[PDB]
Amino acid sequence: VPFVEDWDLVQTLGEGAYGEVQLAVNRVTEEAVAVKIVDMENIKKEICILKMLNHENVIKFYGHRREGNIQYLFMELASGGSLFDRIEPDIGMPEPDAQRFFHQLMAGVVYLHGIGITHRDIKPHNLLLDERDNLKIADYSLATVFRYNNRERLLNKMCGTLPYVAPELLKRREFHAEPVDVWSCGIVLTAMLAGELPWDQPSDSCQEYSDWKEKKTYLNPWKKIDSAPLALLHKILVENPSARITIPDIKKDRWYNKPLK
Ligand SMILES: Cc1cccc(-c2cc(Nc3ccn(C)n3)nc3[nH]cc(C#N)c23)c1
């Protein structure tokens, strides 16, 4: 059919880590997608990981086109925007909405980890919503392979966003990839339930992080959180990554399995 390969760039959806994201509409079909435009090693890695992704809670990759210097990465659009924009400052969101998003985030993260990929920058800006409020993990710029031929490799590069980063990445030379992603899902959950981040970074000099280690849950944000989701947070936000809860065990948690509105 003539013209089915042409896309109109309609509006900017934002600037991400590397380059702008635009809404693109097919001239023939009217299909609406997102395109990441990059004016170009790093991005050969991203494309490679992006082509692996096939899951309902992960942004799908439709292909790429190079036009001289510029690369165009075509991806599933999430017409509902970001989870960041559903979180009300100082309030968060209703507990049942947060639970459903949490279930969907774990499903995506289980998937990634099962194909041996770690995302490394989980936060509400990178968690996108489709038309039915289904959550999708987006942005694979920092993602990397942590398991290959059934052998794990330890990570050593420090990246992410400080309020979301696990404390081992500030303290240790090398660390396991999976508990880092788990930890960040815990900060996300805290943000959904309280509408605020518990600390600037999880270090020994941050008084809010010390308070948490001393169990001062009569302070904010913890005071705003019901005891059941808080008991789960107590198992996620554990400083020793070897003692931190894993995802199979999160799936057995009582709040995780609680029926809610
Ligand atoms: C990480 C990031 C940064 C900027 C834009 C996007 C982004 C925003 C979006 N939908 C919408 C709908 C409405 N707004 C504002 N945004 N859909 C997407 N699908 C893949 C994306 C990617 N990367 C992406 C993602």
From Swiss-Prot:
This protein's UniProt keywords: ATP-binding, Cell cycle, Chromosome, Cytoplasm, Cytoskeleton, Disease variant, DNA damage, DNA repair, Isopeptide bond, Kinase, Nucleotide-binding, Nucleus, Phosphoprotein, Serine/threonine-protein kinase, Transferase, Ubl conjugation
Region described as Interaction with CLSPN: 1-256
GO terms of biological process kind: apoptotic process; apoptotic process involved in development; cellular response to mechanical stimulus; chromatin remodeling; DNA damage checkpoint signaling; DNA damage response; DNA repair; DNA replication
Entry comment describing in which tissues the protein is expressed: Expressed ubiquitously with the most abundant expression in thymus, testis, small intestine and colon.
Cited function: Serine/threonine-protein kinase which is required for checkpoint-mediated cell cycle arrest and activation of DNA repair in response to the presence of DNA damage or unreplicated DNA. May also negatively regulate cell cycle progression during unperturbed cell cycles. This regulation is achieved by a number of mechanisms that together help to preserve the integrity of the genome. Recognizes the substrate consensus sequence [R-X-X-S/T]. Binds to and phosphorylates CDC25A, CDC25B and CDC25C.
Catalytic activity as recorded in UniProt: L-seryl-[protein] + ATP = O-phospho-L-seryl-[protein] + ADP + H(+); L-threonyl-[protein] + ATP = O-phospho-L-threonyl-[protein] + ADP + H(+)
Quaternary structure and interacting proteins, as annotated: Interacts (phosphorylated by ATR) with RAD51. Interacts with and phosphorylates CLSPN, an adapter protein that regulates the ATR-dependent phosphorylation of CHEK1. Interacts with BRCA1. Interacts with and phosphorylates CDC25A, CDC25B and CDC25C. Interacts with FBXO6, which regulates CHEK1. Interacts with PPM1D, which regulates CHEK1 through dephosphorylation. Interacts with TIMELESS; DNA damage-dependent. Interacts with FEM1B; activates CHEK1 in response to stress. Interacts with TLK1. Interacts with XPO1 and YWHAZ. Interacts with CDK5RAP3; antagonizes CHEK1.
Disease: Oocyte/zygote/embryo maturation arrest 21: An autosomal dominant, female infertility disorder characterized by zygote development arrest due to failure of pronuclei fusion.
Lineage of source species: Eukaryota, Metazoa, Chordata, Craniata, Vertebrata
Similarity field: Belongs to the protein kinase superfamily. CAMK Ser/Thr protein kinase family. NIM1 subfamily.
PTM (free text): Phosphorylated by ATR in a RAD17-dependent manner in response to ultraviolet irradiation and inhibition of DNA replication. Phosphorylated by ATM in response to ionizing irradiation. Ubiquitinated. Mono or diubiquitination promotes nuclear exclusion. Ubiquitination and degradation are required to terminate the checkpoint and ensure that activated CHEK1 does not accumulate as cells progress through S phase, when replication forks encounter transient impediments during normal DNA replication. 'Lys-63'-mediated ubiquitination by TRAF4 at Lys-123 activates cell cycle arrest and activation of DNA repair.
Protein's UniProt name: Serine/threonine-protein kinase Chk1
Regulation: Activated through phosphorylation predominantly by ATR but also by ATM in response to DNA damage or inhibition of DNA replication. Activation is modulated by several mediators including CLSPN, BRCA1 and FEM1B. Proteolytic cleavage at the C-terminus by SPRTN during normal DNA replication activates the protein kinase activity.
Enzyme class: transferase
Active site: D121 (proton acceptor)
